[PDB]
């Protein structure tokens, strides 16, 4: 239900239901509020979405999907989208991801540009963004 689910604070775009926080928490305990609402921390996988979601951070800081995973440390997406470097190296801020203080093993959203992405330590609190696909 369209209407229900967006009366609850969500966002409706492109098919998929959004949830901007208005409390922060450390990344997976914002992974955790996410999954208690059939959602998941949210992935980025094209300019408009990323788009939508920088504009409707407003220069705020949100925990995404962004996380390091298997043996090498790769970037990965929390609600299994494959990852793909190529596509997503125009996101990141220039200069980042830097690992600063070999501890940054998260990412967010954190300047308000189509150039947006930060990394940082997972257990640091920010609001957070959770996504969910509409499913008819
Ligand atoms: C606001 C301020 O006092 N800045 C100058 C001191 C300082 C320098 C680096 C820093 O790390 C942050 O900024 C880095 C980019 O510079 C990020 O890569 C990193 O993930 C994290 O977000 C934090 C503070
Ligand atoms: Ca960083
Ligand atoms: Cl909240």
């Not at 959004?18 to 992935?43: D, G």
């Not at 093993?105 to 509409?134: E, M, V």
Request: proline share 6%; aromatic share 16%; charged share 20%.
């Amino acid at each position: 239900d369209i209407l229900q689910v967006v009366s609850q604070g969500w966002k409706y775009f492109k098919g998929n239901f959004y949830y901007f926080s208005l409390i922060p928490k450390t990344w997976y305990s914002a992974e955790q509020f996410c999954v208690s609402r059939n959602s998941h921390l949210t992935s980025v996988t094209s300019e408009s979405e990323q788009e939508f979601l920088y504009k409707t951070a407003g220069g705020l800081i949100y925990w995404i999907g962004l996380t390091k995973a298997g043996m090498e440390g790769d970037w990965s997406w929390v609600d299994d989208t494959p990852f793909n470097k190529v596509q997503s190296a125009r996101f990141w801020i220039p200069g980042e991801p830097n690992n600063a203080g070999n501890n940054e093993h998260c990412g967010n959203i954190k300047a308000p540009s189509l150039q947006a992405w930060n990394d940082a330590p997972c257990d640091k609190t920010f609001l957070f963004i959770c996504k969910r696909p509409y499913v008819p």
